[PDB]
Curated annotation (Swiss-Prot):
EC number(s) stated in the UniProt entry for this protein: 3.2.1.4
Signal in keyword set: yes
Domain of life: Bacteria
Organism per entry: Ruminiclostridium cellulolyticum (strain ATCC 35319 / DSM 5812 / JCM 6584 / H10) (Clostridium cellulolyticum)
Protein encoded by which gene: celCCF
Name listed for the protein in its UniProt record: Endoglucanase F
InterPro entries (UniProt xref): 6-hairpin_glycosidase_sf, 6hp_glycosidase-like_sf, Dockerin_1_rpt, Dockerin_dom, Dockerin_dom_sf, Endo-1-4-beta-glucanase_dom2, Endoglucanase_F_dom3, Glyco_hydro_48F
Length: 629
């Protein structure tokens, strides 16, 4: 039977759980899918409050697993996995096996360059540029008897707000859509949302396809899905604890474990270079695993034809430390219950485990924070690495991977999300590499937390960097990176990050005994419970400093291109963010938002992000479990 838990904090989790699941609060859609946030006027990662992410589903699984632990009821965790497989993992209709089975592992895809500015798109396909071999496809088709991929597509238009519908019908919900397509300078604000299933029924004469990649002839009807590695890994991580807690109570989630294991098997596609080029020697085409960096890259994606059979799959050359999950790798490589069926699944994940922890240590700054990451494709075109640039296995160090507007590693969040996984690993295995990373990182963040007399508090929000880490020498190890520094630009009261911080410090303290980490984690949880609770969970007023882009941000549309969004909005050069999303004017918060801009004030909101709420609950659960008194 499960060990006794701290009743005070267990109660707080149960409370939050009721608030999150309460139909009156509106965190879920009528199909049981969680929204990114209750409020619809939302722009940061997705550009609409009621479009969800894989990241959300994974937090949904974590919440339900924690609920099983305290109620003995795991049916909600099982339903959490049913909704995922039904709505976020493309079905047989969404990814036609007729097309996926025509896939060729020797020529996985056609090379196309990446540009530092949205106006350089569409990018031209070049069949003369080399592409390496895919070593894991035959492992996967053979173990599962299908050519379709089993991973989650990252973003979903839950209530068909954009109008694309399901597979071009325009009326079904949920709707598979995608946003980001045009480089490091394309923010949430500069995209042109498009359907995953493109039959040319919406947009331009060829749907939205020729906005992004330019081919030699007429674009074909096609589908494409993009995975968010960090969410799939988090799904595995959460499924593991659900398995642990269920067994402790004579119950089983055997079936959910099978799904999670298959997902981790396919998740290995993120270990490869975008066009399978050798790691450390980008101009040469890969021969197999020599194109594997073994890290959880920014994505892996696949697509195929709709009215003709063919398909493609790509990895990602860009690697951010915030996506890594050392715990999920430990699980899939050492736990018999999660041993992947594919021949190399488990051992590949063992290699990822060692490589991931080297990456973290390679990026640890003088102060303790973790730097961005590295890439095997400089400027996204496999260009020459400037002399002087530090490297990790041939890959060049990049301060802000994949995005520059704003930099992907300027948000404190990446710090806690990634390191929380390193804390779970250290707690369960006492691994030495994890201890070293945590002792220094934990000391940094503990001196950066501020508690005010009135009970409120602050933690880092926006951070900045200087220098670069020393070139990684595996035999030498961590030099200390004296020339790599982190600067805290400004503080804030991000309840999600505060919660994720509490979580990280709790696991670490529970293993190391660091009293400071323990009292801070608890002060944070207490602070949020006492001063930020509300009817729907927790919240605070925050400024939305980028909302002026709602009205002043120009969206690039190529010369001569004209199209329509399902609702009729015309797409042409000159349009602004709001012009191709005119429905945003019916939002309850619209007039309030615009009035503030007109009067020259930064708008403000009291937001309820689904993941932040779950993060707060889970955090309370972790504490109740590790510190029973
Ligand atoms: O059209 C006929 C040829 O198709 C080839 O396959 C290509 C597809 O046609 C094409 O649409 C896609 S475009 C693809 C981008 O290359 C990739 O960067 C991204 S995922 C992503 C994530 C973040 C950001 I910022 C930007 C992108 O996904 C895009 C699709 O959504 O590319 C494939 C191959 O590169 C066939 O290979 C060929 O046989 C056909 O002739
Ligand atoms: O992609 C990563 C995840 O992002 C999550 O969303 C986070 C944003 O990415 C992050 O930028 C913001 S931090 C943001 C504050 O919320 C805002 O109040 C301030 S406004 C300000 C104030 C003073 C001054 I001087 C200048 C500006 O601006 C900050 C950014 O600069 O936090 C959100 C939520 O944590 C997504 O929720 C998640 O899905 C993504 O994975
Ligand atoms: Ca930009």
């Amino acid at each position: 039977a499960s060990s006794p838990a701290n009743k005070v904090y267990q109660d707080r989790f149960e409370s939050m759980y009721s608030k999150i699941k309460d139909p009156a609060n509106g965190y879920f859609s009528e199909q049981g899918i969680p929204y990114h946030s209750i409020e619809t006027l939302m722009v940061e990662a997705p550009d609409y409050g009621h479009v969800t992410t894989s990241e959300a589903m994974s937090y949904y699984m974590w919440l339900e697993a924690m609920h099983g632990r305290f109620s003995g009821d795991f049916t909600g965790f099982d339903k959490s996995w049913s909704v995922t497989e039904q709505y976020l993992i493309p079905t047989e209709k969404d990814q036609p096996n007729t097309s996926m089975s025509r896939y060729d592992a020797n020529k996985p895809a056609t090379y196309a360059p990446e540009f530092q500015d949205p106006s350089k798109y569409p990018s031209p396909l070049d069949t003369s540029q080399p592409v390496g071999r895919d070593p894991i496809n035959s492992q996967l088709t053979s173990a599962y008897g299908t050519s379709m991929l089993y991973g989650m597509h990252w973003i979903l238009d839950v209530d068909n707000w954009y109008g694309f519908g399901a597979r071009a019908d325009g009326t079904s919900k949920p709707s598979y859509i995608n946003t980001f397509q045009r480089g490091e300078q394309e923010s949430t604000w500069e995209t042109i949302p498009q359907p995953c299933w493109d039959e040319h029924k919406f947009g331009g004469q060829y749907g939205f396809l020729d906005l992004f990649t330019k081919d030699t002839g007429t674009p074909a009807k096609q589908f494409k899905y993009t995975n968010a590695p960090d969410a799939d890994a988090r799904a595995v991580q959460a499924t593991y604890w659900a398995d642990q807690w269920a067994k402790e109570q004579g119950k089983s989630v055997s079936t959910s474990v099978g799904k999670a294991t298959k997902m981790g098997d396919y998740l290995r596609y993120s270990f490869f270079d975008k066009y399978f080029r050798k790691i450390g020697q980008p101009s040469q085409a890969g021969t197999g695993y020599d194109a594997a960096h073994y890290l959880l890259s920014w994505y892996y994606a696949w697509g195929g034809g709709i009215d003709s059979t063919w398909s493609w799959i790509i990895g990602s050359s860009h690697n951010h430390f915030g996506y890594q999950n050392p715990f999920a790798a430990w699980v899939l490589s050492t736990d018999a219950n999660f041993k992947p069926k594919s021949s190399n699944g488990a051992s590949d994940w063992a290699k990822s485990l060692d490589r991931q922890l080297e990456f973290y240590q390679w990026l640890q700054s003088a102060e303790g924070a973790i730097a961005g990451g590295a890439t095997n494709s400089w400027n996204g075109r496999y260009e020459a690495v400037p002399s002087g640039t530090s490297t990790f296995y041939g890959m060049g160090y990049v301060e802000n991977p994949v995005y520059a507007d704003p930099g992907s590693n300027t948000w404190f969040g990446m710090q806690v999300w990634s390191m929380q996984r390193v804390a779970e690993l250290y707690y369960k295995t006492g691994d030495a590499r994890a201890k070293k990373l945590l002792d220094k990182w934990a000391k940094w963040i503990n001196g950066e937390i501020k508690f005010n007399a009135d009970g409120t508090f602050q933690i880092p929000s926006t951070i900045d960097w200087e220098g670069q880490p020393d070139t990684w020498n595996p035999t030498q190890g961590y030099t200390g990176n004296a020339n790599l520094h982190v600067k805290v630009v400004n503080y804030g009261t991000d309840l999600g990050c505060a919660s994720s911080l509490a979580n990280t410090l709790t696991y670490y303290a529970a293993k190391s005994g660091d009293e400071t980490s323990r009292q801070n984690a608890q002060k944070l949880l207490d602070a949020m419970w006492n001063n930020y609770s509300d009817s729907k969970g927790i919240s605070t007023v925050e400024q939305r400093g980028d909302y002026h882009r709602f009205l002043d941000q120009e969206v690039f549309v190529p010369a001569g291109w004209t199209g329509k969004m399902p609702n009729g909005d015309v797409i042409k050069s000159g349009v602004k963010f709001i012009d191709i999303r005119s429905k945003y004017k019916q939002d309850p918060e619209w007039q309030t938002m615009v009035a503030a801009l007109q009067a020259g004030q930064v708008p403000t909101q009291r937001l309820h992000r689904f993941w932040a709420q779950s993060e707060f609950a889970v955090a309370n659960g972790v504490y109740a479990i590790l510190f029973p008194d």
